[PDB]
Structures are given as structure tokens and as C-alpha cells.
Write a protein that binds this ligand. Sequence first.
Ligand SMILES: [Cl-]
Length: 598
Amino acid sequence: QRASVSFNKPGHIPFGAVQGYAPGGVPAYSNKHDHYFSGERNIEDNIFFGFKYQCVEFARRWLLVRKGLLLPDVNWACHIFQLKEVRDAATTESFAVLQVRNGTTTKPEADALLVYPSTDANPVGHVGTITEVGDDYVCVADQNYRFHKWESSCAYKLKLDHRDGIWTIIDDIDADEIEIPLGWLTFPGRANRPEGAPPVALHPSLHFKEPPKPYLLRRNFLPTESKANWLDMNNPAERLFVEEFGMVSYYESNHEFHLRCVAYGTQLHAIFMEATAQVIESDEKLRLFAIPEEFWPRIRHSWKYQQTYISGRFDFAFNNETGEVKCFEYNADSASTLLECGLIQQKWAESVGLDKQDTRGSGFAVERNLKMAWANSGATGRVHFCVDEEREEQYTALYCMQAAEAVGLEGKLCILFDEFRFDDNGHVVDSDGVRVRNVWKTWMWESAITDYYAAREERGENWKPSPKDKVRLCDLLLGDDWEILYFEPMWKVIPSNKAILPMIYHNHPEHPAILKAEYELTDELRKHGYAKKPIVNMIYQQLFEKQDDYYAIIGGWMIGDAFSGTGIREPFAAVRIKTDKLPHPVTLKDIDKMAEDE
Ligand SMILES: [Cl-]
């Protein structure tokens, strides 16, 4: 009936899989899906090509293999069009490129970098490689645009229009979204390196140097400008926040700290998902995780049916001396503190004047990634956002709801269960008679399980749902309709259970962020030092080694499948990321931009 959903889209190939080869033997690797950021550098033979696998990464790696020229650092792809100078990889000698505008009498040529402008859904623009030119087409090799396995030596072919001697490359593959590139960069006077030529030997001056150690430093600040009414009371979420909490100190990181969180967060999310699958398929593990046996079929169906999810938050610890990040838990079934990270902390920074050019807020990607999670969640139609009478649950719901609605979903906030009736056929419908199909909720699956059993005593087990009956939590979350999409799905209780911590350590002891953890105390744990943590028996976890006497826990947000930001609790504290200044930016608008924006 209703079809299974997943964040993996048909015919898109996994992250890092080879899509194909541009002429001259340059592989394009999959970046999973658009706007995906891995946090992982691609460094081969001491050359830093870019982030696995963004479009500038391919451009730089292509340019080096094909022509032996090194593309300088540039943050936004569209800014490549203002490039005047690359460097010869072997000599470091400067080499001048030629800017050729699209839509003039100059025909494009093979072995040029094609640059797309910034659009509304592609703020960074795009770069690819023109591999071949015909009388009415150009072939383009790139990364991070199309995710299919290539059938030939390019990702796609673009129309090349010719009218009155004027040549215009038009991207009209997708029907509505017609994009017209800015132009392309040629490398006049530089031949392609020979077939079979030995690899390019980068001059030692141009090798990747060790970036500075991550840092996370507590700062104390006396504001220059301080705004009194810095939240928008016409936004419901912000109004409820001000009603809970009302209208200095903060944390500053560097970009290396942020990247480590993105990389470790993304990698851990996969590790936790892998261990969740092992629990799902084991009866003994389901028992250990205190899933009642009666719900085993329900939770196993959830795991197969719904591989989408909106939010989850790691708890990280960080050591400033060693740069080490460790993970204590994945609060994978929660959205608590999202609004604070995604919005409040930036608006606070602006009010006291911290929104200077030299930093950005650490929850900058949250809003965009939320919209993206909702768009690829599988939820269509009406989504009921279901909360208790707690302001925090309400404003978390409203913030997730704003994102849903921004991508064409229709939201209804439901506080407790008065919005809902059973119709003449035993189904939960709302006050518009619309039958429930999608539920985002703050209600915990454990509370639903408890409500399920209470209702079972109260109502009987011969009980048929009828229109006279009040809808309860267990009818909303654990009803006869197992094809309702739930945000956060039922299986999400598994990665959230600390019983998983020994499993991820057994599976992945090599991972730098993984704490040693066992179900029984081992002499290794006694020697290192341990904490004994209960689970709904015990787990024993290794101990992990204060600024102005403040202990701080870092929250690392997964929003859909994207690591989307950090927030701190000492009590909620703002996190600012100091921006990497480029010494030799290609254009002034590229300063303070971030490759994370792609
Ligand atoms: Cl459907």
C-alpha cells in the first residue's frame, strides 16, 4: 500500500563510489546527494584536492591530472569564474587562465572549467569540466551535481546553441530549472599531459600542511552594541521561547573543530545505524534493549518501512590540549534544544554584536538541512506535529513545522489529543476529518508503550475503536495503522539506548570518537577509569579527561543524514566559529565564504 521510504534515491550511487572517468583517466566520485558535506579532506600524495566529493574537489583534481596546473583555494564554485592565475604544480610558476563568457562568438573548447552562477537553490554556483565539444552539445564531467553511474566519459551533455555566430551553453536537462552558465576557463598554451605519463609531482611548497589543532575556547565579552528586543514575537517559536525563558560569555571554535565534528558525527551516525540493524535482527538484543516481545514485529517493520528521520543529537566531549573528541551518547530520538542551536544563538550573537565578519554561528546549516530532511523524508500531505503542554516541545515542533511547510508540506500542531477522533472505520482523523498519515512528535516511544498497557487494562482486549472513544497517545503512536510515518521512528529508541555503546566499540574500536565500553567490567576499564551507567543491568564506559570552572557538553546535530551544527550546555551557551581567512582570494566576495555552503 504505502511504499517504503529511505534517504537513498533510486539510481544514485553510494558516497565515494566511482561514477566514471573523464578523458585522461580522472574519476568522478559520488557525493551521495546534493548539498551533502562529509567533513572529510581528499588528500592523495600530499595534495589537498578538496572535500570528498564536492565539485571544486573534482575541478582541482582534474586540472592537475589533465594539465599539471594547481587551482588555488576558492570557497564558492561560482567564484572560479573570476580566476586569473593558477600555478604549475611542478615549478609553482604562475600560469594565466583565460576567462571566456558564455553567450558570445567564441565557441567553447574541450578541457575548460565551466562555471554556473549562484541561484536560489544553489547559492554557491557550480563548476564542472567541459570534456568534449560538438556542433550542438558540450560534454561535462563533474561531481556533486548528478549521482548516477555514467554511461560514457562524462556526467551529462548540455545543449550548445548557435545563433548569429553566438554560442550559448544551456543546461535544460531538468525541465523547469533551466540554468545558463557564466562561461568557462581555458588554459591557452598548456597541452594535456600524455596518456601514460607518470603522475604529477607537486612541488613541496604546495603540499598540504597540517592545519592548526581544533580548539573550543570559552570567551568573556563586554558588548559594544546590545539590542533589547532581539527575538521576533511574531514568530510563534520565538514567542514561546521568550515565554519559557525571557529575553557575556560564549564559546569560540575554529573551523578545524567544526570539521572534526562534521566528519566524526557523520561517521558515527553510520556506526550507530549499523549497530541498530544488528539489534533489530537479534531477539536477544531486542530483549536487552527492553523492547517488549509483543512489539518486536512492529519495530522490525518500522526499520524496513521507514529509513528516514529528521533529527538526532550526539553528546560530545572535547579536550583542548589533545584535540580529541569523544562521543558519550546519541540522543537519536530527540529534537530538544534544536531551536536554540538553529536560531536563538545566532539572534543572540547579533544582539550583542558578535555577528562580525570573522565568525559564524555553529548552527548556520540547521534551517537549510531541516528543509532538506523534510523534502527527502517521504512525508507527503499533512503532517501532525504532536506535543504535550510544554512550551519547549511546542517551539521545537513549530520550528520543525516551519521547515516542513517551506517545502510544501502542511502542518498541524496538536497539543495533547483533543484534535483527534476515531472515524466510523476505527482510524484516527483530525478535526478536518483528515486521516493521520504522518506524525512528528516529542512524545517518547516508551511513554506510548506505557500508555498502551494502561489502555489495555482500562478498555479491555476485546476493544474495538469507535467514534465515542477518545483518542489516546497509544492510539496515535501505536495504533493498527503501521504505515504512518513517525518522526522520530520507533526504531530510534535503539541507537538512543546506551546498551548500544558496547556494541559500537566492539564493531568500531578504531574510531577516534568511540569510548571503550563493555556490559561487564574488564581490567582494562578498571585501569583506565570507568563510569558505571544504568540501562533500562549496566554498561561500563571508559572515563574521558574545565574553563572558568565550567564543564561543557557539546550537542552535535544530525538533521536527516547531514551533520548540521553544534550547541553547548554548561545551561545553553552560544558557539561561534572563527572563519579561515584565505591569504590570496580569487575575488573579494569569496573571503569569508565556506565550502560547507555547497
Ligand atoms: Cl503514501
